[PDB]
Amino acid sequence: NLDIIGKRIEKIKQEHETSWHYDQDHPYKTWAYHGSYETKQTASSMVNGVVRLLTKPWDIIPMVTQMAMTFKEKVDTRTQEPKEGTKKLMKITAEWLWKELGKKKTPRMCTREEFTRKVRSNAALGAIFNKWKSAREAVEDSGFWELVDKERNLHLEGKCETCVYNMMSRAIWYMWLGARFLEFEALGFLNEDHWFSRENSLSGVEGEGLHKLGYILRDVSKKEGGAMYADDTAGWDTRITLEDLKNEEMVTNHMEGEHKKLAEAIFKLTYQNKVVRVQRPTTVMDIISRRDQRGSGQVVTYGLNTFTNMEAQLIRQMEGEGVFKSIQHLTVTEEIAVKNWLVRVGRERLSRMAISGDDCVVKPLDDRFASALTALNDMGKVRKDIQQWEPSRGWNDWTQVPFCSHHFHELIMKDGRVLVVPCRNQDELIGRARISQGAGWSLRETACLGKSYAQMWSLMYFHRRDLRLAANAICSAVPSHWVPTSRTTATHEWMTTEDMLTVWNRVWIQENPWMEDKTPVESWEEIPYLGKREDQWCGSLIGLTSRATWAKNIQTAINQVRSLIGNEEYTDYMPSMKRFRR
Ligand SMILES: CNS(=O)(=O)CC1CCCCC1
Ligand SMILES: [Zn+2]
Ligand SMILES: [Zn+2]
Numbered sequence: 070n071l072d073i074i075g076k077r078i079e080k081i082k083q084e085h086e087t088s089w090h091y092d093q094d095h096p097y098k099t100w101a102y103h104g105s106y107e108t109k110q111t112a113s114s115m116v117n118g119v120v121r122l123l124t125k126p127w128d129i130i131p132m133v134t135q136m137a138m139t140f141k142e143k144v145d146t147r148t149q150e151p152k153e154g155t156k157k158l159m160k161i162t163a164e165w166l167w168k169e170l171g172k173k174k175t176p177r178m179c180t181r182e183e184f185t186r187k188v189r190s191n192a193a194l195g196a197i198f199n200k201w202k203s204a205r206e207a208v209e210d211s212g213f214w215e216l217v218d219k220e221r222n223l224h225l226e227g228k229c230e231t232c233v234y235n236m237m238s239r240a241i242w243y244m245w246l247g248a249r250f251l252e253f254e255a256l257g258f259l260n261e262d263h264w265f266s267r268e269n270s271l272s273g274v275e276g277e278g279l280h281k282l283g284y285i286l287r288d289v290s291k292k293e294g295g296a297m298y299a300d301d302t303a304g305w306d307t308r309i310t311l312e313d314l315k316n317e318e319m320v321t322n323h324m325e326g327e328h329k330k331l332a333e334a335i336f337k338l339t340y341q342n343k344v345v346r347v348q349r350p351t352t353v354m355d356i357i358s359r360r361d362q363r364g365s366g367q368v369v370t371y372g373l374n375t376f377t378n379m380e381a382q383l384i385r386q387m388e389g390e391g392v393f394k395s396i397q398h399l400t401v402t403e404e405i406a407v408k409n410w411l412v413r414v415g416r417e418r419l420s421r422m423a424i425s426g427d428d429c430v431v432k433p434l435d436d437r438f439a440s441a442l443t444a445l446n447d448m449g450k451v452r453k454d455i456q457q458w459e460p461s462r463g464w465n466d467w468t469q470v471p472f473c474s475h476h477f478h479e480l481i482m483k484d485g486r487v488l489v490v491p492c493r494n495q496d497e498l499i500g501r502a503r504i505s506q507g508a509g510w511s512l513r514e515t516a517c518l519g520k521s522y523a524q525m526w527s528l529m530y531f532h533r534r535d536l537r538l539a540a541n542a543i544c545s546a547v548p549s550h551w552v553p554t555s556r557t558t559a560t561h562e563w564m565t566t567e568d569m570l571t572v573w574n575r576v577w578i579q580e581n582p583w584m585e586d587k588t589p590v591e592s593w594e595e596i597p598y599l600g601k602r603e604d605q606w607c608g609s610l611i612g613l614t615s616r617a618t619w620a621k622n623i624q625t626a627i628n629q630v631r632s633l634i635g636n637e638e639y640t641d642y643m644p645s646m647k648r649f650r651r
């Protein structure tokens with residue numbers, strides 16, 4: 070308690086000595102409260118006019134238009150301590166999983182150099198407004214690094230002064246850049262060196278890309294076993310126990326020198342003890358602490374979520390296979406059975422899973438998995454939208470399985486080759502493309518964001534008739550040489566000025582390990598769509614009068630946007646589709 074977080078508390082207390090009160094009508098039950106001080110401020114979703122003007126039929130579809138308008142009583146809940154058999158199952162499994170992830174990887178510090186390059190090409194690292202404006206400025210100034218150095222030597226001493234969270238089913242915890250560097254220096258290796266790649270971790274998909282996830286699910290489908298299970302957890306980040314955070318910290322056992330001490334300090338001082346500053350309307354800043362739940366950078370969060378999800382799902386598999394009999398207590402021969410299962414079949418069992426952070430698909434040995442719920446519930450990984458002891462509903466067809474907000478279609482090209490393509494409800498795709506985040510967008514920047522969506526659609530969703538047509542219209546309405554942009558950057562092969570047919574060929578043919586024949590495609594008309602009825606099922610407007618008028622008059626919509634942007638160089642991409650090819 071206060072010995073580890075006090076220094077951090079004491080510091081904030083002083084900087085607002087003119088305000089510090091122990092407010093008595095404070096909400097917190099599960100968060101420890103420490104005091105308050107005065108503040109006053111709040112970023113809503115702006116519409117991308119370039120995409121909206123070229124998607125007129127969707128102006129009257131509430132599922133699209135409502136997306137652009139507009140649970141902190143789940144962050145204030147508590148998770149019971151797992152039983153002794155559960156804690157033992159997790160410790161054995163975690164120990165074994167780090168060893169296997171570590172067999173072909175070397176833990177190592179990430180550097181100021183690596184950190185700087187990242188800031189100067191815009192990843193959502195999560196810093197704050199103050200002393201320097203943007204992160205881009207602080208990185209170049211030696212002052213910052215002296216701040217970073219003071220804290221760094223403090224961490225080597227087992228103490229912390231400035232590593233404090235800022236709160237804001239979502240709750241994103243920004244830290245100041247300095248503390249972000251210290252987290253990256255010690256744990257960035259997990260992402261930077263691809264510890265959760267499929268090749269390295271067998272269950273993971275880190276770095277895979279949407280054009281790969283469908284093929285991966287189809288490979289899992291080829292295994293002998295039962296249904297495919299894809300149970301979502303209710304508020305995964307809020308269900309991370311202190312026992313979870315202690316099995317995650319066992320990565321430090323693989324480390325040495327400085328690194329081991331620095332990683333140990335991140336885990337002890339910022340993860341297993343946390344200090345947060347929260348905005349309350351009634352408006353003050355609340356300085357609250359707690360030991361458990363997830364609160365890291367979004368990138369370290371992703372890797373430790375994948376690790377702990379891999380661990381949970383191996384254990385649920387162990388329960389289905391009857392490797393242990395009860396979570397109350399493991400016997401001595403049960404420990405040696407668990408260790409032996411891991412050594413004998415652990416890698417084969419990892420390969421039966423696709424795990425992206427809190428998101429999973431498992432193809433277990435058989436359907437005993439569906440009612441193997443005691444360890445899963447006792448670890449606190451409670452399933453969403455199903456009663457706690459009701460057996461899981463599995464999927465019989467890999468093409469029906471939800472994973473990473475998608476499902477996947479099998480699509481045969483007129484030449485017999487097989488594409489496995491990502492898909493989701495088309496209203497969700499159009500609704501998201503019509504939205505921009507943040508202020509001070511020029512017409513040119515708005516156009517270049519619309520071009521990023523259009524190029525993603527040509528690469529990932531070319532099989533949806535409305536999206537191929539709308540993608541061609543947007544790429545026709547935006548100047549040919551203007552570069553696609555995004556403000557929060559998987560693979561992103563659509564972010565380029567290269568010809569989209571050439572990028573399609575590289576992604577889907579040349580570099581696709583599931584495609585044996587490397588014959589390039591010479592036009593978009595060789596590239597197939599879903600069946601007309603399947604396209605409607607997945608939200609296509611084909612068949613509606615609104616959509617026919619839109620398609621027929623598309624050059625008038627393109628010309629409206631060209632007139633707004635002004636006399637620039639434009640390409641007509643509509644003749645890439647047969648109906649506009651005369
Ligand atoms: C490929 N271009 S398209 O989507 O316009 C083709 C038709 C599909 C059947 C209904 C009318 C539109
Ligand atoms: Zn610190
Ligand atoms: Zn679909």
